[PDB]
């Protein structure tokens, strides 16, 4: 017999963060009797994500769960799908100005503020910070940087002296970090805002030494990040409930289909790992 098909569109398909979201979606789908089709580009592209969203709309799938890379850019296609009877859920970045039935993911501005509070605990109220973000024009990255900046401006005298982008690539995270440490005199800490940024930054700090003149606060609980926390290269990471996002999003879609009726962030330090 044939099952409802739910389309899940990721930021980056190969990434281990999205694989964890996928796992959560598959768990919910098996429980609810649906099939998940998991899609995404190799390199981050709003354009490519929208084409995939357009394909699912045309195919009139039973539901779409989509990442939102850029503010305002998904509204048109999301609303068009909703209008055509396809329930749409946004995941791990929202499109607030759209008629999607629900957003499942982190409050990203808040997560930034949380990082900001932890940054003050880590190095105090005075010093220089540099930011490595996963794409300059990526929505949930800008939101994380926004919350962070706001926080340390209200609650410290920490100076952000450099902000650049990894495009959420691992190698480019290392290189942009190495470039930031060079070209800046006294950096005390790095804030890394997507999953691979912290791993790339740790590589760049370990390679110049600067372990430990430079602390790292990064995002997510990937294996190498947890390992870098145990080994002291990373001081704190901000952890999201990725598996739970995938799980909850499928159940919301299946609830809508069947006519039935903001996930916190956690700071992890070496004592926690």
């Amino acid at each position: 017999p044939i099952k409802p098909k739910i389309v899940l569109i990721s930021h980056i398909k190969t990434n281990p963060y999205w694989l964890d979201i996928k796992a959560g979606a598959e768990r919910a789908a098996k429980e609810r009797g649906a099939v998940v089709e998991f899609l995404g580009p190799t390199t981050a592209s709003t354009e490519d994500g929208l084409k995939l969203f357009d394909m699912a709309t045309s195919a009139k799938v039973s539901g779409i769960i989509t990442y939102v890379q850029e503010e305002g850019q998904y509204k048109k296609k999301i609303n068009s799908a909703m209008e055509k009877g396809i329930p749409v859920v946004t995941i791990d970045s929202d499109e607030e100005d759209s008629n999607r039935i629900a957003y499942v993911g982190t409050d990203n501005v808040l997560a930034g503020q949380v990082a900001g509070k932890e940054m003050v605990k880590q190095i105090g109220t005075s010093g220089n910070v540099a930011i490595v973000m996963g794409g300059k024009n990526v929505k949930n990255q800008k939101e994380r940087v926004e919350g962070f900046t706001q926080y340390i401006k209200s609650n410290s005298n920490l100076k952000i002296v450099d902000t650049d982008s990894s495009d959420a690539m691992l190698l480019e995270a290392e290189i942009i970090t190495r470039k930031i440490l060079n070209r800046n005199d006294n950096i005390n800490a790095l804030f890394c805002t997507s999953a691979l940024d912290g791993i790339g930054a740790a590589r760049a700090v370990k390679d110049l030494n600067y372990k430990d003149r430079v602390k790292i606060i990064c995002f997510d609980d990937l294996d190498d990040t947890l390992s870098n926390i145990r080994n002291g290269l990373v001081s704190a990471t901000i952890v999201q409930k990725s598996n739970e996002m995938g799980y909850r999003a499928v159940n919301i879609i299946m609830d809508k289909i069947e006519g039935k009726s903001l996930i916190d962030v956690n700071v992890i330090n070496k004592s926690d790992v």
């Binding site: 044939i2 394909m55 045309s58 195919a59």
Partner: protein, 122 residues
């Protein structure tokens, strides 16, 4: 049989392609026989997709459903374009539909070549 299935799958792909081509020419010049051919070719693609759906297994079932629905979207976009065109409306009013019809037809091509590969692999 598996060969007959991919003959049919290839026929569907040709129908969709030929339907698009005639559709395009019709919007660009209005020759009534182009619209007639546009319409005949989607009728044939639709019926043959329906025929394959009758004899589908556990996997192709999902692809055929996607392809069948996607063809319906093409039918809707192309009919809306034809409708605005024949009403002599500004290009601005059917630009999106006109574009979507091309895009959606290309999605149909990908489902079809996927199907053909699956039939090829018994």
């Amino acid at each position: 049989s598996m060969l007959n299935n991919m003959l049919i799958t290839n026929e569907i792909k040709q129908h969709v392609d030929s339907s698009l081509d005639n559709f395009n020419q019709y919007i660009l010049n209005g020759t009534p026989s182009k619209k007639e051919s546009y319409n005949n070719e989607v009728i044939l693609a639709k019926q043959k997709i329906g025929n394959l759906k009758k004899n589908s297994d556990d996997v192709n079932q999902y692809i055929l459903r996607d392809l069948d629905n996607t063809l319906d979207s093409y039918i809707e976009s192309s009919k809306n374009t034809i409708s605005a065109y024949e009403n002599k409306e500004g290009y601005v009013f059917y630009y999106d539909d006109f574009v979507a019809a091309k895009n959606i037809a290309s999605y149909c091509d990908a489902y079809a070549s996927t199907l053909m590969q699956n039939f090829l692999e018994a």
